[PDB]
Structures are given as structure tokens and as C-alpha cells.
Amino acid sequence: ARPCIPKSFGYSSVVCVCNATYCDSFDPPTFPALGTFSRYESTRSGRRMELSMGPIQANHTGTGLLLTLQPEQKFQKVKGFGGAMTDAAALNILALSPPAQNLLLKSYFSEEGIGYNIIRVPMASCDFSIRTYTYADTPDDFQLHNFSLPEEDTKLKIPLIHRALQLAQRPVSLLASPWTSPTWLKTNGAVNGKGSLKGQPGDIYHQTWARYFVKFLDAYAEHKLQFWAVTAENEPSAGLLSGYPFQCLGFTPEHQRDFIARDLGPTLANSTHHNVRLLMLDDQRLLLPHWAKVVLTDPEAAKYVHGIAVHWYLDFLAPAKATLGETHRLFPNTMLFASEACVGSKFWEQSVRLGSWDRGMQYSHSIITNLLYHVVGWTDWNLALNPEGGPNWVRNFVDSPIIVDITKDTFYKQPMFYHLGHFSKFIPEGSQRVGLVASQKNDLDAVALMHPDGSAVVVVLNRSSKDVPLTIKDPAVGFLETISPGYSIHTYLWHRQ
Numbered sequence: 206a207r208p209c210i211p212k213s214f215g216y217s218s219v220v221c222v223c224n225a226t227y228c229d230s231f232d233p234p235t236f237p238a239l240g241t242f243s244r245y246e247s248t249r250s251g252r253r254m255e256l257s258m259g260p261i262q263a264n265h266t267g268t269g270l271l272l273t274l275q276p277e278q279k280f281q282k283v284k285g286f287g288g289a290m291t292d293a294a295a296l297n298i299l300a301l302s303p304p305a306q307n308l309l310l311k312s313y314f315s316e317e318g319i320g321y322n323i324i325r326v327p328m329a330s331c332d333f334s335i336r337t338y339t340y341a342d343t344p345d346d347f348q349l350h351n352f353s354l355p356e357e358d359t360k361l362k363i364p365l366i367h368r369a370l371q372l373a374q375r376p377v378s379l380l381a382s383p384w385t386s387p388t389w390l391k392t393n394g395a396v397n398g399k400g401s402l403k404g405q406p407g408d409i410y411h412q413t414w415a416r417y418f419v420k421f422l423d424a425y426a427e428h429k430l431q432f433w434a435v436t437a438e439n440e441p442s443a444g445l446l447s448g449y450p451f452q453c454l455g456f457t458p459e460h461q462r463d464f465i466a467r468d469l470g471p472t473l474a475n476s477t478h479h480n481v482r483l484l485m486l487d488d489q490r491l492l493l494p495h496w497a498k499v500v501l502t503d504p505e506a507a508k509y510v511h512g513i514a515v516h517w518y519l520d521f522l523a524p525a526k527a528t529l530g531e532t533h534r535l536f537p538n539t540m541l542f543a544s545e546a547c548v549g550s551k552f553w554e555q556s557v558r559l560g561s562w563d564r565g566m567q568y569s570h571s572i573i574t575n576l577l578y579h580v581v582g583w584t585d586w587n588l589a590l591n592p593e594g595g596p597n598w599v600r601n602f603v604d605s606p607i608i609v610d611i612t613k614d615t616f617y618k619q620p621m622f623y624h625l626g627h628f629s630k631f632i633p634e635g636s637q638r639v640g641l642v643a644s645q646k647n648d649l650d651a652v653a654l655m656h657p658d659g660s661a662v663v664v665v666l667n668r669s670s671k672d673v674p675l676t677i678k679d680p681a682v683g684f685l686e687t688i689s690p691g692y693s694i695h696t697y698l699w700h701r702q
């Protein structure tokens with residue numbers, strides 16, 4: 206319905222400019238007949254999830270790369286896609302006028318947008334907060350009588366999450382993760398730095414920390430919000446690092462194992478929130494398979510663990526096969542889930558680069574890689590940031606797909622936004638990854654999935670400068686003849702029946 210209004214800021218591509226009365230959006234989805242495909246295209250040259258259609262033919266006119274769907278080769282089912290309602294994101298969104306806020310929320314959660322169905326929610330403060338605080342700062346309160354939700358929750362995060370669910374295309378799943386406990390539960394008595402919980406799994410410290418998880422859930426429940434899942438701690442390895450700058454809580458794999466087995470597992474199970482899933486790790490995949498081996502080979506811990514949550518900071522390179530692949534092999538019945546990704550901390554690089562095509566490609570290349578190694582979901586970090594990558598109480602170092610400029614009541618939708626949407630829009634919960642076979646060595650990245658209703662969705666990413674002529678074969682339908690232009694991403698959809 207409404208096209209991107211482009212704007213360059215000097216980087217390789219454009220942002221799309223939205224404001225109180227205008228934002229780019231889609232029409233409702235339309236279901237073309239068997240023999241017709243839909244293609245959505247984004248390009249570094251400026252196209253933004255532009256729709257076209259064409260035929261799937263019985264004859265084959267391409268002589269280059271062929272990608273053959275193999276619908277009978279079945280892999281993981283998809284949980285979903287989303288991002289984090291941090292203090293910083295809530296603050297930025299609420300800094301726009303109400304009509305602009307709604308266009309931002311629709312861009313992410315609406316069928317007029319890209320269909321998010323996951324929100325990660327920090328349990329109290331992180332670096333993307335404008336202060337350090339927790340839910341129970343009154344010291345030596347072991348029964349957590351003074352546990353309460355501050356304004357950040359009751360005024361910023363919660364009302365914005367209700368509004369997102371109201372707008373939402375699909376059921377949305379909430380995920381919670383803590384950065385720090387009350388410092389009076391910590392070896393180091395500090396919000397950050399090298400410090401873990403005091404004492405031993407089973408003691409009053411470990412039992413109070415677990416009670417906190419339930420207290421959190423009770424409070425959101427009062428606010429009529431329920432969680433799909435919680436993580437056992439955000440990046441537990443960080444809090445073992447001397448002088449780590451942000452809110453953390455250190456756990457060795459062994460400590461997490463025993464904390465889950467002795468404390469968090471039982472406490473959750475004995476509560477009215479026993480249906481909430483528990484995910485372990487919530488940290489870099491570089492810590493796999495080791496971290497999985499340690500926790501999941503103890504039946505006492507394993508009974509409480511539904512999945513393994515992973516992060517990747519994308520400016521790096523950690524091999525997927527040895528980590529995700531091998532972890533799947535060793536524990537094929539415990540789901541992998543990407544719970545946090547972000548980019549831009551290269552000290553020589555701007556935290557926000559408005560219009561960076563590279564950062565976009567980094568998003569989609571990662572999602573493809575994830576999906577190719579059994580990951581069932583992918584969650585972005587901050588939903589929105591200001592143009593400096595903030596607010597952040599320690600230091601700005603990362604980008605966000607939506608950058609908010611409050612002095613102009615405008616927000617910019619980055620290439621990252623559209624690289625994400627090529628997946629989130631077109632891969633509903635319960636879609637299953639299926640085979641897609643390359644006829645020859647090639648420069649593309651691609652992934653095929655089958656919707657719950659049986660239809661096909663294929664994403665093709667070209668991170669090269671050169672156009673790649675391409676045929677996609679569906680055995681039940683025929684040959685789809687196309688070209689993957691240099692620096693483009695396409696999502697193809699077609700009925701198979």
C-alpha cells in the first residue's frame with residue numbers, strides 16, 4: 206500500500222523514513238493460484254520488500270544454478286522471530302507522538318508490517334537502561350517482600366507490549382532474561398564485574414534468586430502478560446570476567462546445572478507458572494557443545510530444560526557446525542533458539558550506520574545459517590535505538606533496525622529491518638524447514654521451509670556484487686525462473702496444491 210520514502214545518510218543504501226502520518230507498509234497477503242509464485246525483493250540499490258508475481262513452468266530455460274525443493278526432507282519447526290523490549294527501546298518509542306508510535310509498532314507486529322511474534326523482555330536493568338536497578342534492591346530481603354515493578358516496567362515496557370499484542374498478526378510469545386540479581390545475593394556485592402551468586406545451590410541465596418523468577422512472573426501476570434519462556438540468566442559467562450562493565454551474574458556451566466537442578470527448576474515447577482519453558486545458556490554459541498554436555502547429562506537438570514538459547518555478536522565468526530550442529534547431534538530433542546543478536550561494535554565503526562546494507566546482509570546471513578543448523582527462532586536485540594545507539598548507561602556500541610529521531614518525530618527503518626522481515630513476515634510459527642538442494646557450487650545463501658498449510662517459502666540472499674541467474678524446482682509444480690541480483694534478498698512464496 207505505501208512505498209518506502211528513501212533517504213541516504215552517506216552509507217551504502219537508504220533508510221525508509223516514517224513519521225506521525227506516514228510509514229511504508231504492505232497490503233493484506235493475497236493467495237495466488239497454483240502455477241504462480243510471489244517474489245518479494247529488497248536491493249542495496251533501494252528496492253524494499255517489493256512484490257511481483259510470475260509463473261512456475263513445466264519447461265526449464267535456465268542453464269545455471271538450480272535449487273530443488275525436497276519437501277519430504279523434514280527438519281525443525283519454527284518458533285518465531287522478534288526482538289527485545291529493552292528500557293532503551295521503550296524510551297525511544299515513547300519519545301515519538303502517539304500516531305508515530307503506532308506506525309512503528311505496526312511496522313514490526315502487524316500484517317501491514319513484518320509479523321513479529323517474539324518479544325524478549327529484560328528482568329530489570331541492563332546496559333540498555335538509563336540507570337542500574339533491580340526488582341528487590343532493599344538488602345537482605347530473602348522472602349522478597351519488597352519485590353516490585355518500577356516505572357520502566359509499569360509505564361514503559363508493559364503498556365508497549367500490550368499495544369504490540371493488540372496489533373499483532375499472530376500470537377506473540379514473551380521471553381524473559383535477567384542480567385543481574387540484587388547485589389546482596391552476589392559474591393562481589395556489585396551490579397557488574399566478576400561476581401556470581403553467594404553460597405551454594407540449595408541455600409537461601411540460590412532459593413531467593415529462584416523465588417525472584419516467580420515473583421517477576423507473578424507481577425507481569427497481574428498485568429495480564431504471560432511468558433512462553435525464561436532464560437536461566439543472560440550471558441552467564443560474562444559475570445566470570447574480571448571487571449565486566451554491564452549488569453551480569455556469573456555461572457560456570459556446573460553452577461548453572463546445579464542452580465537449575467536444585468533451585469530454579471523445582472521452584473518454577475512448584476509454582477502456578479510451571480508451564481513456562483526454561484532455556485539454558487542464553488550466551489555465545491562458542492560455549493557449545495560443552496555447556497550443553499555439562500547441564501544436559503545430569504538428569505536432575507535436564508528434566509527442567511526445554512531448550513538452549515544462543516547469542517551471536519555478528520561482527521565475529523564462530524563455526525556453526527561444531528557448535529549448533531554438534532549440539533543437535535548430542536541432544537536432538539532439546540531445541541536451539543537464537544535469543545539475541547546485534548551488530549556494530551567495531552571500535553572504528555559508528556554504532557549506528559543509517560542505511561548500511563552490510564549490517565542488513567549480516568542479519569540475513571546469520572538467520573539462514575541458524576535455520577540451516579536446527580535453530581527454531583531468531584530474536585533481535587533492542588527493537589529501537591536513538592541515532593547514537595542509545596540510551597545505554599555504560600556505552601553505546603550497537604545498531605538497531607529502527608532508529609528513532611525524536612526531535613523530528615521521525616523513525617528510520619534500516620536495511621536490517623527488511624533483512625529480518627524477509628524471514629519474519631513469511632515464516633509463521635510451525636513452519637518447518639525442508640530440503641533445498643543446490644545443483645552446483647554457488648555464491649548464494651538460501652533456505653526453504655513449508656508453511657503449516659503446505660505452501661512453500663524460499664529465501665535467497667546474494668551477498669556478492671554479481672547477478673546470479675537461478676532456477677528453483679518444485680517437484681510437484683515445476684520450474685520457477687529468476688535472477689538473484691547482486692546485493693539483494695528475495696523471498697519466494699508459492700502454493701504447492
Ligand SMILES: *[C@H]1O[C@H](CO)[C@@H](O)[C@H](O)[C@H]1NC(C)=O
Nearest residue numbers: 210222223224225226227228
Ligand atoms: C511525514 O511528515 C512530513 C513532515 O512532517 C510530511 O511533509 C511528509 O509528507 C511525511 N512523510 C512523507 C515524505 O510522506
